[PDB]
Design an enzyme around this catalytic site. Structure first.
Site, PDB file in Angstrom:
ATOM      1  N   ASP A 102     -38.747  27.986  81.194  1.00 33.03           N
ATOM      2  CA  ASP A 102     -39.356  27.310  79.916  1.00 33.03           C
ATOM      3  C   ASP A 102     -41.061  27.648  80.187  1.00 33.03           C
ATOM      4  O   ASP A 102     -41.667  27.679  80.948  1.00 33.03           O
ATOM      5  CB  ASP A 102     -39.227  25.915  79.878  1.00 33.03           C
ATOM      6  N   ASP A 127     -36.619  19.948  75.943  1.00 32.50           N
ATOM      7  CA  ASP A 127     -36.784  20.863  74.962  1.00 32.50           C
ATOM      8  C   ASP A 127     -35.583  21.397  74.094  1.00 32.50           C
ATOM      9  O   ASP A 127     -35.682  22.001  73.076  1.00 32.50           O
ATOM     10  CB  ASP A 127     -37.199  22.586  75.428  1.00 32.50           C
ATOM     11  N   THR A 159     -40.975  28.921  72.915  1.00 29.49           N
ATOM     12  CA  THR A 159     -42.313  29.123  73.490  1.00 29.49           C
ATOM     13  C   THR A 159     -42.134  30.399  74.487  1.00 29.49           C
ATOM     14  O   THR A 159     -42.952  31.059  74.815  1.00 29.49           O
ATOM     15  CB  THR A 159     -43.050  28.261  74.390  1.00 29.49           C
ATOM     16  N   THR A 160     -41.247  30.831  74.987  1.00 31.28           N
ATOM     17  CA  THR A 160     -40.779  32.042  75.451  1.00 31.28           C
ATOM     18  C   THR A 160     -40.805  33.212  74.737  1.00 31.28           C
ATOM     19  O   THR A 160     -41.397  34.195  75.063  1.00 31.28           O
ATOM     20  CB  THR A 160     -39.426  32.207  76.502  1.00 31.28           C
TER      21      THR A 160
END
Lengths: 513, 510, 514
Positions: free
Chosen positions: A49, A383, A82-83
């Protein structure tokens, strides 16, 4: 002091930025890999993450701050992707480099990114199509959203569980979860597992021989502090520092105890009859043995160890309101939960409240004896809840797994601008930036990164198909037919956040020490 | 590099910066030169003397540079040296000045190739307005004042102390034997140094001057054709020596008898063939002398390399080693051979009277041979400026008085044309400004004052400045009416070659 | 001691990359002249890509390889060798980006093969037939000379080059391999180049003005000596006794006497009048005595001519080259319609022009005898090889990177073979080509992207090979201006670039060798 100017100075910024993205390139999809992070505090965090990895510790640069700032913006709204964010910014820069190095301006590349980007938001509005908010359709999105965060096996356990959490709204559609977050963690036999418990669960419970194990009509009064001291909402001092002090503290706890229990037995009788319905009391602190005997016998279920975090959620779930004293309270203002039952597993007690009047709280119960497992499974949940949450709010969802990336790239067709060619540099760089998402799946999987990508372009030429690289074999496919679709929110907020960041990097041509 | 091949010493940074800075150093020897000056540059070279010059040709050839950019311009300067005299200095300062101005252009963001283009344009416009800067011209070449005004500028460029005497002298001694209208010879005029006496005591002599003393009788015949031999005597037989003195006594008798009878034959062969003046670079023995008194031949004791050289070019002679009797084939165009003392030293005087192939000599008298080497630069440039091959030489204002005129026209013209070319055109104006800067530096005052006050007076076509006190503060002098004039042709080749040189060298990067 | 795998490819790309810099500032007329003092210390002025590689000192294997393949191209076209290097460099650059991400060299190569076939077929489509007129030859001639010299001096060399090719049609060659005699004249300016139809001779007579206009010239080119002086020889060396050497001196001088006499008998037999002249060209001396006798008869006799003059005369004039004189009929001797002697500089050159049966023209370059006169020699050299190609092919396209954008556009759009393996090399191939037009813009000072979008769009709308106007560095139609390129130029950059690339691309080891 020292000052770096012109294209030389811009190099120092973009080379750093590209290098951070290179390290994180390893992550994305489930054919990616966890990265081990150790800050300066010990403990092994094993996280793939990207948001967790940027905040806890990362390589120093000025651009280290920028990749985290956009990670911060992305996570808060959408809470996925977010990766994904990291890799497009990078590949954009690469392209921009080739032209400036030829003997061109940073600023003309930048303006062309704005033109390029605007066509792509508009591209999303077409390519998107309405899909159900029914449970099984959301399984197919949940399966995919979990997979970009964390590994395959970890993704599979959580699919069904995460969907049932977000489905139990009141038709309250938001991008994020606010009060359906409850983290309970357990060291247990099952190495990795997540259990679905609907409604709010309490940290620990007390149990007595006479206590009612199964309660079918629970009138909750929520109290805080305590049966140790009368007239309190925060704790009183102690006396034990001398030999003489000990004796006194215990002796006047008898008075304190004696005043309290009375309130509760008289309130029980109004509401329940004698024992004909059940009564629940929430102690958030110590429960004295003398009071455990009386409350338990009476038909009152005492619960030991609850949080301030339980206290907020409990109020919404039962319809009751918080009190911080153990005192009488009107029947009206007591909450109703239509089931309370205590499952004692391992060395902890989980007392559930079920039949929630208003469901906006759910609980996921994290198993994992090991520190290394607990950190993997638990950080995927957060997430994950917010990922699926975006899909239920969103009326339209976009096909996934690089389906839209390759389409947008071909349509945006070179030699469409003719204005000065300032627009041409940008629209050309932005085409290749999008195609990072094929490339990194292909890297992770067998065959060469561009070798799989040219087959995607070819299949894309055949219309009626959105074609990308699979997450689970790294081969070409019609994404839509397999079911691998990603929410709209990821894909919309990606474009805004990627363009701004990388725009600013090229604008920087003076970096001062 | 990145390569272990592809050899360059120029290119990238080094083309743009290093080449220009080198041109600048060569051309520092000409920002103390050209017109009014008191500079002297001493250069040695193991020539057993001190060599004093304020001419570009001798400075340049001495000085070697390992870069093609700086080396190439030396050739352009030589080219202007052949076609014309003084202005050699002006060729190098111009190319070198323009190149300093060029590098500044490169800095801003302008490309090499347009800048290259804009000079060719500026050079063409400057030449086109150039015959419209004619203010004065000769019509008679047999008139000493009209020739001397021209001469004067060459001399000036050397020293500002020797302008008056010399400028008169050359015209007096003639470089007007030729019509100078199709044909001119410059190897049939030399500058011949006579050591002894002052340099205002420098004299007029007509036809070939050789320093070496005359021996024997002297001729005055018109049958006297020149025979030139480097060594016709060394002893007709060489000795070997067996008693380490002679080999030996009866043999010494024979060695002398055979010398005297072989030299009789040799010197009688010269006598008979119509050669009645023999130039000997060998050694005059008593036996050889004794023969030439009988036949009536003027005898020239000795010669050095320098003296032999002028005979082979002028005469159509060859200098043969001899000890076995020869005959005429050197021939000569000289009828008369007279004898006259210049410097109180017996000098051999050759003359004939004609226009074409006719000879003259600007002969000098000086304290030392060093003082005569500088004077010589002034004089040889004064012969090479004469060559224009017209009798109306279309004189334009000498002394750098044209320069500001050219600069004003060019800067205005630049404004009219658009694009990147124009900046090069403006720079082209400020390269001419090099000449007014160098005259200012020797004069003793800064550049700002002279260029502004020449500009202030507008179109004049006279204004230039000297070494004087008049040259400093009001910075105004008349160099149209001081009889400081140069030729149209000398300024033409100077500007032309310099623009060509600046363009080729700005191109390099290998 | 080995550079293997990534390390082996790294060495080649780095070299190509530094080289490219040099030979872009030689590209087209907007490129810049270059000199060497880095080759040997002496001053050379050269502006050709092949030539500049030889003159320098090349030790680097990749630079050397590019110079070798260069050699073949330079012979045939003599243009496009400024270009060879540029296309090679970019072609590698493209490959490098993919490899670094993660790509095999071999897939790159396959897509090169596919690339090459399509690219060559594009030449065939797009080619425009031209005539074989003068006008059309002027435009191959002027643009090629414009590469190798300025614009000013190049326009002078344009006239000389074109009349020669028209004359070569008369011989009916479809090639050029004669009319390439370059002869130098001594002058004080270089802005003249003169055409002389027949031959020119390095030296003339040692006696001026024998008969310096010959109306009717019967050329005996000989090479036996009519001067050998008074030297004492035997077999050409000293011998032990004086007398033995002397005896030969008599017979040798006597032999010469009879040969000079044969010129006197030959003038009556061929001539018979002084209404006709007689030409002698001897590559060896002739006595001053012999010239006076010949001169009054109305014979011009030349001394100290070269062996190169002699071979040329024998072809053009229809002459003979003999080791004897004798009494020969005019049937054997060649004839020239005119002889004139033109004195200019410090050396006077006897021209022997308007030859009957020519096959050699002389292009007479005047110059100061600096390196500038060598510069117009090598400009003129490759301008002859250029207009040779126009005669070879039938079709000449408008250039200035017009051709190259058109060919690149055709590749980007579809897969030429329809497979993904090919496609990875094909992108690489298309962007490599774009270097040639964009960089003319770069030299001039006009941004490179702006010309690409414009030049390419105008192709699409029209079907015109729109090119670059060099000076502005902005686009314009290359056809009208005269910036043209032969079939052979655009063919030979294509072949050289592919073959050279695939042997350096496919290195996997470089190991040193004694």
């Amino acid at each position: 002091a020292e000052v770096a100017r012109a294209q030389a100075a811009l190099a120092v910024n973009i080379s750093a930025a590209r290098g951070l993205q290179d390290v994180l390139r390893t992550n994305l999809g489930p054919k990616g890999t966890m990265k081990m992070l150790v800050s300066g505090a010990g403990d092994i965090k094993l996280t793939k993450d990207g948001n967790v990895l940027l905040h806890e510790m990362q390589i120093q640069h000025p651009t280290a701050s920028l990749i985290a700032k956009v990670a911060t913006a992305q996570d808060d709204i959408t809470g996925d992707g977010t990766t994904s964010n990291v890799l497009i910014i990078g590949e954009l820069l690469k392209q921009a480099d080739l032209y400036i190095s030829e003997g061109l301006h940073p600023r003309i590349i930048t303006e062309g990114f704005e033109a390029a980007k605007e066509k792509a938001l508009q591209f999303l509005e077409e390519v998107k199509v309405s899909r159900e908010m029914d449970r099984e359709t959301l399984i197919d999105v949940a399966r995919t959203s979990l997979r970009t965060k964390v590994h395959a096996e970890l993704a599979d356990v959580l699919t069904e569980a995460v969907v049932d959490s977000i489905l139990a709204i009141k038709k309250q559609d938001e991008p994020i979860d606010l009060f359906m977050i409850e983290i309970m963690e357990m060291k247990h036999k099952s190495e990795t597992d997540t259990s679905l418990i609907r409604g709010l669960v309490l940290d620990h419970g007390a149990r007595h021989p006479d206590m009612k194990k199964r309660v079918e009509d629970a009138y909750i009064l929520t109290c805080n502090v305590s049966l140790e001291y009368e007239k309190t909402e925060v704790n009183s001092g102690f006396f034990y520092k001398s030999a003489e002090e000990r004796e006194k503290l215990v002796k006047a706890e008898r008075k304190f105890i004696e005043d309290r229990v009375k309130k509760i037995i008289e309130l029980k009788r109004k509401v329940c009859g004698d024992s004909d319905k059940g009564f629940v009391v929430i102690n958030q602190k110590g429960i004295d043995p003398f009071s455990l005997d009386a409350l338990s016998k009476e038909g009152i279920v005492a619960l030991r160890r609850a949080k301030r975090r339980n206290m907020e959620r409990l109020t919404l779930a039962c319809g009751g309101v918080a009190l911080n004293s153990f005192d009488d309270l009107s029947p009206d203002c007591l909450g109703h939960a239509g089931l309370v039952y205590e499952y004692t597993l391992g060395e902890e007690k989980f007392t559930f409240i079920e039949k929630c009047n208003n469901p906006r709280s759910v609980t996921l119960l994290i198993k994992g004896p090991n520190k290394h497992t607990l950190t993997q499974i638990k950080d995927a949940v957060r997430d994950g809840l917010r990922a699926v949450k975006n899909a239920i709010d969103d009326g339209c969802v976009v096909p996934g797994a690089g389906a839209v990336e390759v389409a947008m790239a071909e349509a945006l067709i070179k030699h469409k601008p003719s204005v000065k060619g300032r627009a041409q540099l940008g629209v050309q760089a932005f085409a290749d930036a999008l195609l990072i998402i094929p490339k990194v799946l292909a890297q992770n999987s067998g065959f060469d990164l561009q070798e799989t990508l040219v087959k995607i372009q070819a299949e894309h030429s055949e219309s009626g198909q959105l074609v990308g690289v699979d997450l689970n074999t790294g081969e070409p496919m019609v994404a839509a037919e397999v079911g691998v679709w990603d929410n709209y929110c990821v894909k919309k907020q990606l474009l805004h956040s990627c363009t701004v960041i990388a725009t600013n990097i090229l604008l920087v041509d003076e970096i001062m020490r | 590099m990145l390569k272990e091949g592809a050899k360059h010493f120029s290119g990238l940074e080094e083309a743009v910066y290093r080449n220009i800075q080198a041109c600048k150093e060569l051309a520092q020897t000409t920002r103390t030169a050209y017109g009014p000056n008191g500079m002297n540059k001493m250069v040695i070279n193991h020539l057993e003397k001190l060599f004093v010059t304020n001419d570009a040709a001798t400075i340049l050839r001495e000085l070697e540079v390992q870069h093609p950019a700086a080396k190439m311009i030396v050739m352009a300067s030589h080219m202007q040296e052949q076609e014309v005299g003084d202005g050699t200095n002006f060729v190098l300062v111009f190319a070198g000045a323009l190149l300093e101005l060029a590098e500044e252009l490169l800095r801003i963001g302008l490309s090499v190739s347009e800048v290259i283009e804009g000079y060719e344009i500026a050079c063409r416009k400057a030449h086109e307005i150039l015959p419209n800067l004619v203010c004065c011209s000769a019509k008679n070449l047999r008139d000493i004042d009209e020739v001397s005004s021209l001469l004067r500028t060459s001399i000036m460029s050397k020293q500002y102390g020797n302008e008056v005497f010399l400028a008169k002298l050359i015209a007096q001694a003639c470089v007007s034997i030729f019509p100078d209208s199709g044909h001119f010879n410059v190897d049939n005029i030399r500058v011949c140094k006579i050591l002894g006496s002052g340099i205002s005591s420098s004299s007029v002599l007509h036809g070939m001057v050789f320093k070496k003393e005359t021996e024997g009788d002297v001729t005055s015949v018109k049958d006297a054709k020149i025979a030139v031999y480097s060594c016709p005597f060394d002893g007709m037989i060489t000795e070997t020596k067996g008693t380490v003195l002679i080999k030996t006594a009866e043999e010494l008798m024979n060695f002398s008898k055979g010398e005297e009878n072989l030299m009789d034959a040799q010197v009688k062969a010269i006598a008979d063939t119509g050669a009645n003046v023999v130039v000997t670079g060998g050694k005059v023995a008593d036996m050889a002398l004794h023969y030439a008194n009988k036949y009536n031949i003027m005898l020239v004791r000795l010669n050095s390399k320098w003296d032999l050289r002028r005979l082979c070019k002028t005469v159509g002679a060859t200098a043969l080693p001899r000890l076995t009797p020869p005959v005429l084939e050197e021939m000569g165009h000289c009828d008369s051979v007279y004898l006259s003392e210049v410097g109180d030293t017996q000098v051999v005087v050759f003359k004939h009277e004609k226009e074409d192939g006719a000879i003259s000599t600007i002969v000098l008298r000086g304290s030392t041979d060093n003082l005569m080497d500088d004077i010589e630069r002034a004089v040889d440039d004064g012969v090479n400026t004469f060559k224009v091959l017209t009798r109306d030489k279309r004189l334009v204002p000498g002394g750098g008085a044209t320069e500001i005129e050219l600069a004003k026209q060019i800067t205005s013209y630049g404004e009219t044309c658009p694009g990147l070319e124009q900046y090069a055109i403006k720079k082209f104006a400020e390269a001419f400004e090099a000449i007014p800067r160098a005259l200012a530096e020797n004069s003793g005052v800064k550049a700002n004052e002279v260029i502004s006050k020449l500009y202030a007076v507008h179109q004049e076509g006279n204004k230039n400045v000297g070494l004087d006190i008049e040259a400093e503060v009001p910075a105004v002098k008349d160099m149209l009416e001081a009889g400081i004039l140069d030729t149209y042709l000398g300024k033409y080749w100077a500007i032309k070659l310099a623009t060509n040189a600046a363009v080729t060298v700005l191109r390099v990067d290998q």
